């Protein structure tokens, strides 16, 4: 997951660099107006972060290894709430 | 049937939360913009309206002259 | 209500973990479940309050990070999606 | 062993011998084909590569307030 | 306009934000010039902070209609984002420039 | 069965099978401390919530009872004619 | 008697009382330790009084006392935002360093306390002097007390360690001295208020830059010039290690703000791609190396190398965020690395007598207070949010990425490896099986002393991690003065 | 230009002659009776090595000067590189070859860049008070001089940056610069 | 079934009380003590950060345009 | 980017009910392959084609064997070389 | 296989009056289909 957060951290850098802040009402107010290449740079980064925390084919190996915890933890954190971050 | 006492950790946290609530409320400027009694003391003591501006200017000018006098002595014609 | 949904699980986790000696096993189970249930109920109301009547709720508490252009606040925002999840 | 008495540990001779070899290893380094190449890879090439990329791309971009119809390339 | 508070009297720059006409030997006036450079830069940037703030309230208030109603507030921030940045006094102190060039 | 455990280890989480004889009492005091902070937070969240839209009177919006922004609006809106 | 001069005088009075009290009372060793501790407490109390009176938006140096009796080598003291928090960090840390050794010295206690008290006066003098030669005089004055501290109270390899830290620092500082003397010759003076006003020619700035950077790279340290840290920070006594990592590493960082950013901005701008290559290399090579380090203090010592690279990259970013992040990360690393050395050099090494990681396992089972603080310090060393370590890392890395993206991405990768080596160490010590079978005697958990020097360190990082504004509010206007550049439409108002 | 072979011979002779001096002292300080002909028998290698380093050094710098068609500090360091390399070859150890080449080439190059006063520093023959005063008070300079050394961008955005920025992009990418208005009313 | 809470805090056996090494006095009252006192004085400290000075000027300068509304026009 | 209108109307009925057809069909083969036939699968298992397929899918496409050896241990050897050389 | 066998679009792209240019952010943003090139 920390690998994903590095990509996500870089993604917020690209938001901060282009928009001055990373608050939701600002990013989405200016989204239709910024460089298309910027959005790809932005967009790719958080998808990789999203890839790690939702176990996509690249970073996916933690979720089944993460079944070494107690069963309710598997149900709550690793099957219905966090994987959906 | 041993009983576990509350201990000191409970009181510090509750006391800290209670003190934080009390201290913040009494430190507010109030409905009006007039500062508190203690607010005016911390401004009077830290006035320094131009004191750092005066002292610094004389120090810089004095050392600039001092550098000038050495430049004269160090570059004198042999 | 909007900010109570935030701190209630936090308080329940602090007491159970840092005072498990004081409340004991059943005391911890009583607080974590009660704090989560009370929090759970308030979310159901928030779904009606925000999702159904379309009132997004903005709550800003204090600044977190403030450097020149970056003003990141401990601010919370309720809209349709956050009450859905 | 130290100035302040500690607990009794099962100080394993093998592990003690391993931790001494590591602390003394610098005394036995030698210049060979292998040790020269590795020491040249890490110290010169990889740093000079990053320095080349850093030098070549310094000022290449600015993201600040970039819009559609305006590129990111700065140079 | 908002009245100038007592605090915003002791820190007003009595000098323009420039280095033309400043004798660098005289310390008070050079320091005042550096103060005027920085404070103007910060004043210009907190404009973006207030515009950003207003745009946030506009965005939520307008919901889906934010793409059509918050336009004036959108551009004003974008102009500020293009221009405002605390860059320091050091370049301008060390490098004179003229428009008639 | 219960696994053996050292009696000399002090852990704030309670340890291995900790349940003090006064667990019911302490669970009530901590609940009260938990309750008071939530009340303190609820009072804060009532004061500083921000809404740009006002709920219709008939709809089920239970926050209108305790928040200041809506209560001030409804109090002012009651003046008709 | 200025408050700043009071700061340098209190620890000297403590030295006097420590070395004379036997003529007024065989005096007990507890007396010496109490004199030294109270001495550092009153020094902390004075630094807190100064901070209350300190003004956040003044370009004048504050609490300066007029000398006017000019000599060749005079000591002028003054404080602004960039120096105020380093002074506070020195005054907070040193009492913790004194308590961290309360029971573990047991011999030459008078010498240990006098050396520790003298180090406080010198390190504070470094952050307070308003002259570039004055800066150098105090940056180097600490070597002989440091040399004798390690040799008197260090571990088995303290002879090689004390030589390494002395000779590395002197050799680099000699190149910084050459650069400093060139500046004073051209300008006639090294006083800050008039040396910053001057303008050096580009090639002069270039050669001035190498001389200064060679010293700041030995002290950062950068990777490849860091042998001295591996030896000294491990072989030193615990108090020495805390001071060495949490205060002495910061002198080169504070020195970049006073010696190169204001006077060498063209050189700094044109050479960033060299600083960033070294900074990027240090982030990777150190991170990989500490993953394979088997001495627990050397692992924690090696982490300091990786983090120091991140705030070294920040100070050269020429951005408001990078510079604020660099001071905040240097401050954050001061608390967290101090706690990790207390955990390793103080808690583990006093119980076992060894620092090899092979001998530790399952310590959580018998020591849940140590593991609770150790984990929070392992999170903070990994840059986890709600620690001041995250706010500093994010702001420092954002500036690095904006100034030069290729170095930012590589320096960003430290988000993986800091976590990697910090959590891996944590598991091999606190988790990872049941209590190690090598321990014959059972271990006790944290004593009240160990709990409260860790709770204090984890409180500072967490509170500052939730509200970093306490520190950022006093850095905004002064940090602004060191930025070099202009905007197309804001420059040259008329 | 210069004669590389002729200069090297003079280079080989001058520092080889001192080696011949040091060789005679070894023969003089020799304990066992070896006669006068041990100048070239037991110590001839010593004098030969000196004549080799001095020859290699003066050959290559002269050669480096011919190849580069310039006279600067680079040539003495290059001269010292082979001079250092030659001494290492006598020990028959590759690290000795590289290290002594590095040592010699560095000292002999910083000696020529700095111009060590061992023969005398260059006298400025000017009012040395005036040079210091100019360097002391040159506190503000024309922006063009800085722009030559530091260039444009990297946070250095002088007035008129955006106009020339569009022109540079058009010349390189053939794309007109025109940011879109963010207001629907425009 | 549950065990009664056990364990020795600070290693103190149930028979005796924690012994003081002498650091507790200065540390709890001089170090932490002064750290709470300073915190109290910080609530009353005047706000001299550049930002709030700048927001006040940024406000008026924005009120000269149509972005903000003047509480006291003219 | 809206495609929802075509989803309700343009989609053909066969593809709309196609997942149900496979769901209610392939259940019976799986239910017949056990407790009714119960040996067709083992015949596939003990062939050389089935044995290689079975393990590959059981070893999770091998995206953890190349991870552990060519990613994780590469870094560990890189750290080894830097400390020792 | 899918590239050689996949159905063509069975509906003309929807057209919004005025292109929704004002509602999507004016001419400076991306608008919808309005009497545009066939696809
Ligand atoms: C900064 C606050 C925290 C901020 C956030 C920090 C977040 C990271 C930390 C999180 C980790 C916390 C660790 C768990 C703590 C509790 C578990 C434990 O270890 O108990 C062992 C043990 C407590 O066991 P106990 O049976 O209850 O007490 C018996 C001890 O013998 C009692 O020993 P004691 O009597 O020596 O303890 C009191 C001690 C207090 O020492 C201190 O000064 C430090 C605390 C100051 C807080 C401000 O000294 C004193 O006696 C009083 C002298 C000084 C008082 C002030 C005087 C001012 C005079 C001038 C005006 O440790 C302690 O003594 C705790 C002391 C500090 C407690 C702080 C509050 C704890 C809150 C717990 C929840 C944390 C939530 C975090 C936010 C979410
Ligand atoms: C995590 C990212 C995930 C991946 C997403 C990538 C998405 C794509 C982004 C790629 C990007 C973003 C910068 C990345 C880093 C910036 C911040 C880092 C991240 C911040 C967190 C890097 O693109 C760079 O690549 C360089 C390669 O050398 C080139 O530099 C120079 O190359 C040589 C001259 O071209 C020089 O000789 C050499 O001297 C330079 O060096 C440039 O192409 C450019 O600077 C910009 O790509 C874009 O550049 C522009 C100009 O090209 C293109 O526009 C086109 O220009 C016309 C002719 O081109 C076309 O006619 C026209 O149709 C179109 O208008 C775009 O089409 C696109 O290409
Ligand atoms: C890592 C060492 C950096 C130490 C910092 C030295 C402090 C600055 C001196 C650098 C130096 C020689 C450098 C020679 C090689 C450097 C070491 C070689 C490798 C070291 C093993 C620049 O020397 C050059 O300076 C240029 C002007 O800037 C001149 O043009 C050149 O002619 C001159 O040679 C001396 O010049 C300097 O002297 C001052 C008079 O007080 C003059 O005003 C300037 O003349 C000034 O520049
Ligand atoms: C960011 C740094 C941390 C900031 C927050 C600091 C804490 C804030 C409040 C956290 C919630 C309360 C946690 C209580 C956990 C249970 C108490 C405990 O430590 O028991 C020790 C327990 C003892 O519990 P025990 O009762 O089972 O002990 C006896 C049995 N043995 C000894 C065998 C275990 O020790 C452990 O087993 C675990 C060791 C590691 C402990 C880590 C606990 C969590 C610490 C806080 C995590 C904060 C996460 C921050 C996330 C950041 C997000 C960006
Ligand atoms: C790990 C923690 C991470 C925290 C991250 C930062 C917070 C984000 C997550 C929490 C979100 C909600 C935070 C709490 C919001 C409300 C705080 C509060 O209690 O305010 C009430 C009090 C008076 O209100 P007042 O500010 O005067 O309103 C008018 C001013 N215009 O205002 C006050 O000033 C009173 C302050 C009282 C002390 C603080 C109370 C904190 C409540 C949460 C405590 C959590 C820790 C628990 C510790 C152990 C408890 C057993
Ligand atoms: C238990 C004890 C707890 C610690 C109590 C002290 C620590 C408090 C920390 C915060 C202090 C806040 C109070 C304060 O602001 O004091 C400021 C004090 C006011 O004095 P003032 O009139 O302003 O004179 C200034 C001249 N430059 O400024 C002063 O002049 C005080 C001067 C103190 C001199 C100390 C000399 C050495 C003492 C050892
Ligand atoms: C934890 C909850 C802390 C209490 C939350 C509310 C505190 C408060 O009432 O405000 C105090 C102060 C003002 O907030 P400020 O950041 O300046 O900007 C807000 C815009 N009105 O903001 C502050 O100074 C809050 C300081 C919080 C310090 C961290 C507390 C950590 C507790 C563990
Ligand atoms: C458990 C999980 C339950 C499902 C979780 C998702 C919830 C939303 C899923 C869909 C629910 C649809 C709404 C269900 C009830 C619909 C309804 O019509 O209830 C009527 C009730 C009256 O509300 P009101 O607006 O005042 O009506 C005025 C009309 N003249 O409207 C109401 O608001 C009454 C319901 C209030 C429920 C509060 C529960 C607190 C616990
Ligand atoms: C602000 C500018 C300040 C300028 C300098 C002003 C003075 C600074 C201090 C200089 C030296 C002062 C020495 C103070 C201690 C003298 C009193 C004394 O006698 O202490 C004796 C002490 C213990 O010895 P004793 O108790 O007699 O034997 C017991 C055996 N069971 O034995 C000791 O304490 C010896 C301690 C070890 C040696 C000191 C640390 C190394 C110092 C290197 C000296 C050379 C560099 C000097 C640097 C000065 C500061 C920069
Ligand atoms: C600039 C400074 C240049 C170095 C100055 C001195 C260089 C030198 O003479 O080093 C000799 C050294 C010989 O190394 P070696 O033969 O392997 O013997 C090792 C036994 N411990 O050789 C070396 O260690 C390094 C050889 C390569 C140097 C490349 C530069």
**What does H23-46 look like in DSSP terms, one character per residue?**
HHHHHHH-SS---TTHHHHTSHHH
Residue A47: CB partners within 8 Å, gap ≥ 6?
A: none
- Assign 3-state DSSP to chain F and report helix, strand, coil percentages, each to 5: 50, 0, 50
- Tell me the chain G residues in contact with residue F12 when contact means C-beta distances shorter than 8 Å: 368-369
Contact D42 J84 (CB under 8 A): no
Strand partners, J39: none
Which of E56, E80, E81 is the mutation pick for testing C, counting most C CBs within 10 A?
Answer: E56
Kindly report the nearest CA distance between residue H15 and chain B, in angstroms: 38
Q: Is the CB of G332 under 6 A from ligand 9?
A: no
Cα–Cα nearest to G332, from G462, G244, G450: G462
Count the neighbouring beta carbons within 10 Å of the beta carbon of residue J62: 10
Strand partners, A34: D67
Contact K11 J6 (CB under 8 A): yes
The number of the ligand 10 atom at minimal distance from the alpha carbon of H93 is 16
Of residues A20, A24, A84, nearest to C69 (C-beta): A20
Cα–Cα nearest to G455, from I10, E93, F32: I10
In contact, E53 and C63? CB cutoff 8 Å: no
In contact, G168 and G233? CB cutoff 8 Å: no
How many CB pairs below 8 A link D and J?
Answer: 9
3-state secondary structure of C58: strand
Residue H128: CB partners within 8 Å, gap ≥ 6?
A: B75
Compute the distance between CA of residue I74 and CA of residue G472 in angstroms, rounded to an integer: 37
Give residue numbers after which chain A breaks (C–N above 2.5 Å). Answer: none
Handedness of CA G174, G177, G178, G179 (dihedral sign): positive
In contact, C77 and C59? CB cutoff 8 Å: yes
Q: What's the residue count for chain B? A: 78
Compute the distance between CA of residue G398 and CA of residue H153 in angstroms, rounded to an integer: 18
Find the distance separating the first CA and the last CA of chain H, reported in whole Å: 70
Q: What's the residue count for chain I? A: 74
Query: Scanning the structure block, which residue is given the tokens 């009252």?
Result: I29
Mutate to test the pocket of ligand 8, among C40, C41, C48, C49 (most ligand atoms within 8 A of CB): C48
Count the neighbouring beta carbons within 10 Å of the beta carbon of residue H92: 8
In contact, B78 and E53? CB cutoff 8 Å: no
Q: E90: which 2 tokens?
A: 């050091």
Mutate to test the pocket of ligand 9, among G12, G114, G117, G121 (most ligand atoms within 8 A of CB): G114
Measure the CA dihedral F47/F52/F55/F57, to 10°.
80
Residue of chain C nearest E44, judged by CA positions: C68
Helix-helix angle G320-341:G296-315, to 10 degrees:
170
The number of the ligand 2 atom at minimal distance from the alpha carbon of A10 is 21
SS (H, E, C) G268-329: HHHHHHHHHHHHHHHHHHHHHHHCCCCEHHHHHHHHHHHHHHHHHHHHCCCCHHHHHHHHHH
The number of the ligand 10 atom at minimal distance from the alpha carbon of H100 is 9
Q: What are the CA-CA distances from residue G361 to residues D14, G347, G374, G428, H5 (Å)?
A: 18, 14, 14, 6, 72
Compute the distance between CA of residue G423 and CA of residue G380 in angstroms, rounded to an integer: 11
Strand partners, G131: G191
Contact J83 G289 (CB under 8 A): yes
Cα–Cα nearest to C18, from B20, B8, G484: B8
Mutate to test the pocket of ligand 5, among F27, F34, F41 (most ligand atoms within 8 A of CB): F41
With 0-12 / 13-18 / 19 or more C-beta atoms within 10 angstroms meaning exposed / middle / buried, residue D58 is: buried
Half-sphere exposure at residue D61, Cβ-oriented, CA atoms within 13 angstroms: 18
Contact B71 H128 (CB under 8 A): no
Compute the distance between CA of residue G80 and CA of residue G70 in angstroms, rounded to an integer: 23
Residue of chain D nearest J81, judged by CA positions: D38
In contact, G131 and G154? CB cutoff 8 Å: no
Mutate to test the pocket of ligand 1, among I16, I22, I28, I41 (most ligand atoms within 8 A of CB): I28
Among all bound ligands, the one having the nearest atom to the CA of I25 is 1
Q: Which residues of A33-66 are buried (b: 16+ CB within 10 A; e: fewer)?
A: bbbeebeebbeebbbbbebbbbbeeebbeebeeb
In contact, G259 and G132? CB cutoff 8 Å: yes
Contact H154 D75 (CB under 8 A): no
Query: Scanning the structure block, which residue is given the tokens 């090139």?
Result: K37
Compute the distance between CA of residue E45 and CA of residue E95 in angstroms, rounded to an integer: 23
Q: What are the CA-CA distances from residue A41 to residues A11, G404, J54 (Å)?
A: 8, 16, 40
Q: G393: which 2 tokens?
A: 């890392």
Q: What are the CA-CA distances from residue G22 to residues G17, G27, G35, G117 (Å)?
A: 9, 6, 13, 18
Q: Is the CB of H168 under 6 A from ligand 10?
A: no
Compute the distance between CA of residue G352 and CA of residue G442 in angstroms, rounded to an integer: 11
Residue of chain F nearest G444, judged by CA positions: F9
Q: Give CA angle at G372 (G366, G377), nearest 5°.
A: 130
Q: What is the CA radius of gyration of chain B?
A: 29
3-state secondary structure of A82: coil
Compute the distance between CA of residue G145 and CA of residue F43 in angstroms, rounded to an integer: 57
Compute the distance between CA of residue E61 and CA of residue E53 in angstroms, rounded to an integer: 13
Q: What are the CA-CA distances from residue K32 to residues C70, G20, G386, K16, K19 (Å)?
A: 34, 88, 44, 7, 5
In contact, G242 and G93? CB cutoff 8 Å: yes
Q: If you take atom 21 of ligand 6, which residue's CA is the nearest one?
A: B45
Which of A11, A15, A37 is the mutation pick for testing D, counting most D CBs within 10 A?
Answer: A37
Range of the domain at H86: 1-116
Experimental method: cryo-EM
Greatest alpha-carbon span in chain G: 80
Phi-psi region of G414 (alpha: psi -120 to 50; beta: other; left: phi over 0): alpha
Helices of type H across chain F: 23-48, 68-77
Residue of chain I nearest G451, judged by CA positions: I10
Q: What are the CA-CA distances from residue J81 to residues B57, D37, G341 (Å)?
A: 57, 12, 26
Helix-helix angle G388-403:G265-290, to 10 degrees:
130
Q: What's the residue count for chain J? A: 85
Cα–Cα nearest to G130, from B49, E37, B63: B63
Cα–Cα nearest to E82, from E51, E55, E56: E51
SS (H, E, C) J13-57: HHHHCHHHHHHHHHHHHHHHHHHHHCCHHHHHHCCHHHHHHHHHH
Q: Give CA angle at G60 (G58, G66), nearest 5°.
A: 140
Among all bound ligands, the one having the nearest atom to the CA of H100 is 10
Contact H159 G201 (CB under 8 A): no
Find the distance separating the first CA and the last CA of chain B, reported in whole Å: 99
Measure the CA dihedral G416/G418/G421/G426, to 10°.
-110
In contact, G481 and E90? CB cutoff 8 Å: yes
3-state secondary structure of B78: coil
Compute the distance between CA of residue B58 and CA of residue G349 in angstroms, rounded to an integer: 55
Compute the distance between CA of residue G417 and CA of residue H85 in angstroms, rounded to an integer: 42
Compute the distance between CA of residue G107 and CA of residue G101 in angstroms, rounded to an integer: 12
Q: G494: which 2 tokens?
A: 């008329």
Compute the distance between CA of residue H169 and CA of residue H151 in angstroms, rounded to an integer: 16
Residue I14: CB partners within 8 Å, gap ≥ 6?
A: I8
Residue G166: CB partners within 8 Å, gap ≥ 6?
A: G143, G146, G147
Query: Scanning the structure block, which residue is given the tokens 């792209």?
Result: K13
In contact, E77 and E55? CB cutoff 8 Å: yes
Residue H130: CB partners within 8 Å, gap ≥ 6?
A: none
Q: What is the CA radius of gyration of chain F?
A: 24
Element (H, E) at C62: strand C57-67
J8 DSSP 8-state letter = H
Compute the distance between CA of residue E41 and CA of residue E57 in angstroms, rounded to an integer: 25
Compute the distance between CA of residue B11 and CA of residue B18 in angstroms, rounded to an integer: 10
Peptide bond into G221 cis (omega under 30): yes
Element (H, E) at C75: strand C70-78
Cα–Cα nearest to G240, from G451, G98, G110: G98
Instruction: Indicate contact of D with F: 3+ CB pairs under 8 A.
Output: no
Q: What is the CA radius of gyration of chain J?
A: 24
F66 DSSP 8-state letter = T
Q: K9: which 2 tokens?
A: 């679009």
Range of the domain at E62: 1-101
Compute the distance between CA of residue K27 and CA of residue G308 in angstroms, rounded to an integer: 49
Compute the distance between CA of residue E75 and CA of residue D67 in angstroms, rounded to an integer: 12
Give residue G454's Cα distance to chain centre.
18
Count the neighbouring beta carbons within 10 Å of the beta carbon of residue D47: 20
Q: Is the CB of B14 under 6 A from ligand 1?
A: no
Cα–Cα nearest to G476, from A4, D46, I49, H72: I49
Compute the distance between CA of residue H119 and CA of residue H14 in angstroms, rounded to an integer: 17
Q: Per the structure, how many domains does chain E have? A: 1
Cα–Cα nearest to G404, from H152, C68, D61, E91: D61
3-state secondary structure of E2: coil
Compute the distance between CA of residue F61 and CA of residue C50 in angstroms, rounded to an integer: 9
Of residues G320, G391, G467, nearest to C68 (C-beta): G320
Compute the distance between CA of residue G375 and CA of residue G379 in angstroms, rounded to an integer: 6
Count the neighbouring beta carbons within 10 Å of the beta carbon of residue I1: 5
Q: Is the CB of H98 under 6 A from ligand 10?
A: yes
The number of the ligand 6 atom at minimal distance from the alpha carbon of G63 is 27
Q: Does G104 touch chain F (CB under 8 A)?
A: no
Q: What's the residue count for chain H? A: 186
- Classify strands E95-96 and H141-142 as parallel, antiparallel or unpaired: parallel
- Tell me the chain F residues in contact with residue C26 when contact means C-beta distances shorter than 8 Å: 19, 23, 27
Contact C27 F48 (CB under 8 A): no
Compute the distance between CA of residue G154 and CA of residue G176 in angstroms, rounded to an integer: 29
Compute the distance between CA of residue G170 and CA of residue G215 in angstroms, rounded to an integer: 9
Compute the distance between CA of residue J59 and CA of residue G387 in angstroms, rounded to an integer: 39
Half-sphere exposure at residue G282, Cβ-oriented, CA atoms within 13 angstroms: 28
Q: F65: which 2 tokens?
A: 């009872």
Count the neighbouring beta carbons within 10 Å of the beta carbon of residue G442: 12
Query: Scanning the structure block, which residue is given the tokens 């030193």?
Result: G236
Contact F23 C8 (CB under 8 A): no
**What are the φ and ψ backbone dihedral angles of C26, each rounded to 5 degrees?**
-75, -35
Q: B30: which 2 tokens?
A: 């109030």
SS (H, E, C) chain G: CCHHHHHHHHHHHHHHHHCCHHHCCCCCHHHHHHHHHHHHHHHHHHHHHHHHHCCCCCCCCECCCCCCCCCCCCCCECECHHHHHHHHHHHHHHHHHHHCCCCCCCCCHHHHHHHHHHHHHHHHHHHHECEHHHHHHHHHHCHHHHHHHHHHHCCCCHHHHHHHHHHHHHHHHHHHHHHHHHHHHHHCCCEHHHHCCCCCCHHHHHHHHHHHHHHHHHHCCCCCCCHHHHHHHHHCCHHHHHHHHHHHHHHHHHHHHHHCCCCCHHHHHHHHHHHHHHHHHHHHHHHHHHCCCCEHHHHHHHHHHHHHHHHHHHHCCCCHHHHHHHHHHHHHHHHHHHHHHHHHHHHHHHHHCCCEHHHCCCCCCCCHHHHHHHHHHHHHHCCCCCCHHHHHHHHHHHHHHHHCHHHHHHHHCHHHHHHHHHHHHHHHHHCCCCCCCCECCCCCCCCHHHHHHHHHHHHHHHHHHHCCHHHHCCCHHHHHHHCCCECCCCCCCC
- Classify strands C57-67 and C70-78 as parallel, antiparallel or unpaired: antiparallel
Helices of type H across H69-142: 74-91, 94-114, 128-137
Q: Does G272 touch chain D (CB under 8 A)?
A: yes
Chains that touch H (3 or more CB pairs under 8 A): A, B, D, E, G, K
């Amino acid at each position: 997951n920390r690998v994903g957060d590095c990509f996500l951290t870089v993604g917020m850098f690209a938001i901060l660099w282009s928009l001055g802040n990373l608050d939701y009402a600002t990013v989405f107010s200016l989204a239709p107006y910024i460089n298309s290449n910027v959005v790809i740079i932005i967009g790719i980064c958080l998808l990789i972060g999203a890839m790690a925390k939702s176990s996509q084919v690249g970073l996916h190996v933690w979720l089944p290894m993460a079944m070494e915890g107690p069963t309710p933890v598997s149900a709550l954190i690793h099957a219905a709430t966090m994987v959906t971050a | 049937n041993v009983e576990e006492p509350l201990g000191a950790a409970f009181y510090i946290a509750v006391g800290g939360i209670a003190s934080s609530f009390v201290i913040y409320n009494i430190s507010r400027p109030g409905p009006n913009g007039e500062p508190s009694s203690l607010h005016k003391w911390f401004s009077k003591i830290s006035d320094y309206k131009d004191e750092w501006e005066t002292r610094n200017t004389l120090m810089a000018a004095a050392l600039e002259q001092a550098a000038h006098d050495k430049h004269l002595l160090l570059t004198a014609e042999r | 209500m909007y900010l109570s949904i935030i701190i209630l699980p936090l308080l329940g986790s602090v007491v159970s973990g840092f005072f498990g000696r004081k409340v004991g096993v059943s005391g911890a189970q009583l607080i974590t479940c009660s704090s989560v249930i009370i929090t759970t109920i308030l979310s159901i109301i928030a779904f009606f309050e925000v999702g159904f009547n379309n009132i997004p709720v903005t709550i800003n508490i204090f600044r977190w990070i403030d450097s020149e252009w970056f003003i990141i606040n401990w601010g919370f925002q309720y809209d349709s999606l956050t009450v859905s999840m | 062993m130290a100035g302040l008495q500690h607990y009794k540990i099962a100080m394993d001779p093998a592990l003690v011998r391993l931790g001494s070899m590591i602390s003394n290893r610098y005394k036995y380094f030698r210049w060979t084909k292998r040790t020269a190449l590795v020491s040249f890879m890490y110290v010169v090439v990889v740093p000079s590569t990053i320095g080349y990329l850093a030098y070549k791309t310094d000022g290449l971009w600015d993201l600040r307030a970039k819009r559609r119809g305006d590129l990111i390339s700065e140079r | 306009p908002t009245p100038e508070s007592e605090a915003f009297l002791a820190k007003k720059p009595q000098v323009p934000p420039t280095f033309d006409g400043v004798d660098y030997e005289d310390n008070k006036r050079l320091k005042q010039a550096q103060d005027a450079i920085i404070r103007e830069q910060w004043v210009q940037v907190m404009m973006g902070r207030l515009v950003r703030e207003e745009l946030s309230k506009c965005y939520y208030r307008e919901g889906v209609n934010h793409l059509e109603k918050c336009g004036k507030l959108r551009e004003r921030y974008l102009q500020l984002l293009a221009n405002a940045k605390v860059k320091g006094y050091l370049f301008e102190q060390q490098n004179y420039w003229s428009k008639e060039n | 069965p219960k696994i053996p455990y050292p009696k000399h280890v002090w852990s704030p989480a309670g340890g291995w099978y900790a349940q003090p004889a006064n667990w019911k009492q302490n669970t009530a005091i901590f609940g009260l401390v938990i309750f008071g902070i939530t009340a303190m937070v609820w009072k804060y969240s009532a004061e500083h919530e921000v809404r740009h839209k006002m709920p219709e009177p008939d709809r089920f919006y239970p926050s209108r009872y305790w928040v200041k922004q809506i209560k001030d609006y409804e109090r002012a809106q009651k003046e008709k004619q | 008697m200025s408050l700043l001069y009071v700061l340098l005088i209190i620890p000297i009075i403590g030295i006097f009382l420590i070395s004379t009290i036997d003529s007024f009372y065989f005096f007990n060793v507890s007396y010496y330790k109490k004199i030294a501790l109270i001495t550092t407490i009153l020094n902390l109390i004075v630094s807190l009084i100064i901070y209350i009176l300190f003004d956040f938006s003044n370009n004048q140096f504050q609490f300066i006392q007029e000398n006017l009796d000019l000599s060749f080598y005079d000591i002028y003291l003054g404080v602004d935002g960039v120096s105020i928090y380093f002074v506070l960090l020195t005054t907070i840390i040193m009492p913790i360093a004194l308590v961290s050794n309360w029971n573990s010295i047991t011999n030459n206690i008078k010498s240990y306390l006098i050396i520790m008290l003298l180090l406080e006066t010198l390190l504070l003098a470094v952050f307070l002097v308003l002259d570039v030669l004055l800066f150098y005089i105090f940056f180097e004055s600490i070597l002989p007390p440091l040399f004798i501290l390690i040799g008197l109270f260090g571990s088995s390899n303290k002879v090689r360690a004390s030589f390494y830290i002395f000779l590395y620092t002197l050799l680099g500082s000699l190149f910084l001295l050459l650069s400093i003397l060139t500046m004073s010759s051209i300008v006639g003076t090294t006083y800050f208020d008039v040396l910053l006003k001057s303008s050096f020619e580009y090639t002069t700035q270039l050669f001035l830059f190498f001389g200064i950077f060679i010293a700041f790279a030995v002290k950062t340290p950068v990777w490849g010039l860091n042998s001295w840290l591996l030896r000294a920070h491990v072989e030193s006594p615990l108090g020495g290690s805390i001071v060495l990592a949490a205060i002495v590493l910061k002198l080169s960082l504070y020195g970049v703000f006073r010696l190169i950013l204001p006077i060498l901005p063209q050189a700094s701008l044109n050479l960033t791609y060299i600083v960033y290559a070294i900074g990027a290399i240090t982030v990777l090579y150190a991170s990989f190396s500490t993953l394979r380090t088997v001495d627990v203090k050397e692992l924690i010592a090696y982490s300091s190398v990786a983090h120091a690279a991140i705030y070294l990259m920040g100070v050269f970013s020429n951005t408001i965020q990078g510079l604020e992040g660099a001071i905040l990360l240097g401050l954050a690393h001061g608390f967290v690395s101090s706690g990790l050395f207390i955990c390793a050099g103080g808690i583990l090494y006093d119980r076992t007598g060894t620092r090899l990681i092979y001998f530790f396992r399952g310590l959580t089972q018998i020591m849940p207070l140590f593991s609770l603080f150790f984990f929070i310090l392992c999170l903070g060393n990994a840059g986890t949010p709600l620690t001041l370590n995250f706010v500093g890392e994010f702001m420092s890395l954002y500036g690095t990425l904006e100034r030069l993206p290729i170095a930012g991405m590589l320096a960003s990768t430290s988000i993986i490896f800091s976590a990697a080596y910090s959590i891996y160490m944590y598991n091999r010590i606190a988790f990872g099986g049941s209590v190690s079978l090598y321990f014959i005697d059972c271990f006790r958990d944290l004593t009240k002393r160990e709990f409260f020097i860790l709770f204090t360190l984890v409180s500072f990082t967490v509170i500052l991690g939730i509200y970093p504004s306490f520190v950022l509010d006093g850095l905004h206007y002064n940090i602004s003065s060191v930025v070099y550049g202009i905007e197309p439409n804001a420059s040259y108002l008329t | 230009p210069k004669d590389a072979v002729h200069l090297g011979l003079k280079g080989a002779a001058v520092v080889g002659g001192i080696g011949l001096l040091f060789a005679a002292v070894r023969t003089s300080l020799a304990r066992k009776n070896v006669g006068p002909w041990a100048i070239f028998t037991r110590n001839g290698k010593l004098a030969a090595t000196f004549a080799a380093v001095g020859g290699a050094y003066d050959f290559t710098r002269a050669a480096a000067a011919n190849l580069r068609e310039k006279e600067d500090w680079v040539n003495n360091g290059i001269g010292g590189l082979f001079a250092g390399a030659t001494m290492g070859l006598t020990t028959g150890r590759i690290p000795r070859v590289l290290g002594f080449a590095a040592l010699t080439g560095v000292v002999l190059a910083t000696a020529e860049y700095a111009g060590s006063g061992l023969r005398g520093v260059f006298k400025r023959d000017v009012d040395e008070y005036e040079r210091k005063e100019f360097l002391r008070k040159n506190r503000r300079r024309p922006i063009e001089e800085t722009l030559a050394e530091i260039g444009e961008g990297r946070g250095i955005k002088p007035p008129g940056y955006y106009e020339r920025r569009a022109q540079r992009l058009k010349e390189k990418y053939g794309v007109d610069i025109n940011p879109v208005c963010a207001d629907p009313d425009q | 079934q549950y065990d009664p809470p056990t364990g020795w805090l600070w290693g103190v056996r149930p028979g005796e009380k924690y012994q003081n090494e002498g650091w507790e006095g200065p540390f709890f009252y001089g170090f932490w003590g002064s750290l709470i006192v300073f915190a109290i004085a910080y609530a009353y400290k005047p706000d001299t950060s550049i930002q709030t000075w700048a927001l006040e000027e940024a406000r008026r300068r924005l009120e000269a345009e149509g972005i903000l509304e003047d509480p006291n026009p003219t | 980017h809206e495609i929802m209108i075509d989803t309700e109307f343009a989609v053909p009925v066969l593809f709309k009910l196609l997942p149900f057809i496979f769901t209610i069909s392939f259940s019976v083969i799986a239910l017949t392959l056990s407790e009714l036939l119960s040996e067709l699968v083992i015949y596939f298992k003990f062939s050389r084609f089935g044995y290689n397929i079975f393990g590959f899918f059981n070893q999770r496409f091998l995206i953890e064997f190349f991870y552990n050896k060519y990613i994780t241990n590469l870094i560990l050897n890189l750290g080894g070389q830097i400390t020792k050389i | 296989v899918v590239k050689l066998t996949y159905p063509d679009r069975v509906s003309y792209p929807r057209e919004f009056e005025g292109g929704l240019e004002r509602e999507l952010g004016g001419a400076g943003a991306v608008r919808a289909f309005l009497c545009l090139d066939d696809e």
